[PDB]
Amino acid sequence: WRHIRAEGLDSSYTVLFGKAEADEIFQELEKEVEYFTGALARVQVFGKWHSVPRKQATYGDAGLTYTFSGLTLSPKPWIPVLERIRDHVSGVTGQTFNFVLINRYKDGSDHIGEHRDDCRELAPGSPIASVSFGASRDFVFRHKDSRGKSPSRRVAVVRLPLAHGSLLMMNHPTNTHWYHSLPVRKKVLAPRVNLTFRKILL
DNA sequence: AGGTGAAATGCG
DNA sequence: TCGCATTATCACC
């Protein structure tokens, strides 16, 4: 495993699946995952509504829901594909998950803006499992006190590419202290599907 | 209450 | 292209 470590950043990266396998899995994912459309894909930020620059889906146990930027998504019942991955992931990390956010970026122009994972529904201390398939993309971590016109402290930005069939483990207190994003990457033409598995509450 | 801080856009 | 700081409104803490 590759241990990524800065001030308040505890996370780890490894490649879980071969190319052949990851290729197979990526194919099933594409075949099976039903993405949200219309109303279920428009967040609100600074009081302005927008369709997300990508496609989303939530799969998970009954009852749970996932809310961000003015949008609430109740999860779809598990499917054999995802159920197989979470079990594999659960097995390797030790940790357990009852939910998964799926973002698919069709090309390097689809992206996600900066934020942390810090919602009431999120289990305090629980790690998050980012499992990527398809195109490599750069995943960027910036520190809480480092953003803005003139920051509190200036710390090295942490950049890294998330390869095909790879795991990124976001342990605690990572998501307390560090913002993350997937910036635009014009030179990318292929799609990427990312699975963030997490533990949700109530 | 009373405080904070968050998708596209427009720089360098 | 890319990084990233702005946005001047409003849900959430």
Describe the structure.
The chain is α+β, with helices and mostly antiparallel strands. It has a single domain, classed as Sandwich (Jelly Rolls). Helix content is 16%, strand content 39%. It contains three helices and 15 strands. The strands form four sheets. Strands 1-2-13-10-15-8-5 form a seven-stranded antiparallel beta sheet. A hairpin with a 2-residue loop joins strand 1 and strand 2 (9-15). The longest helix has 14 residues, at 19-32. The structure holds a DNA duplex (12 and 13 nucleotides). This is DNA oxidative demethylase ALKBH2. Substrate binds at residues 46-48, 66-68, 118. Residues 96-201 form the Fe2OG dioxygenase domain. Its cofactor is Fe(2+). It is found in: Nucleus; Nucleus, Nucleolus; Nucleus, Nucleoplasm.
The main β sheet shows up as:
7 strands, antiparallel
Per DSSP, what share of the residues sits in E-state strands of 2 or more residues? Answer: 35-45%
**Shape assignment:** globular
Q: Compute the gyration radius: what is it?
A: 16 Å
Please estimate the helix content: 10-25%
Helix- and strand-based class? alpha+beta
Number of domains: 1
Widest sheet: strand ordering: 1-2-13-10-15-8-5
Could you tell me the CATH topology label: Jelly Rolls
Subunit structure: Interacts with PCNA homotrimer; this interaction is enhanced during the S-phase of the cell cycle. Interacts with nucleolar proteins NCL, UBTF and NPM1. Interacts with XRCC5-XRCC6 heterodimer.
Subcellular location: Nucleus; Nucleus, Nucleolus; Nucleus, Nucleoplasm
EC number: 1.14.11.33
GO molecular function: broad specificity oxidative DNA demethylase activity; cytosine C-5 DNA demethylase activity; ferrous iron binding; rDNA binding
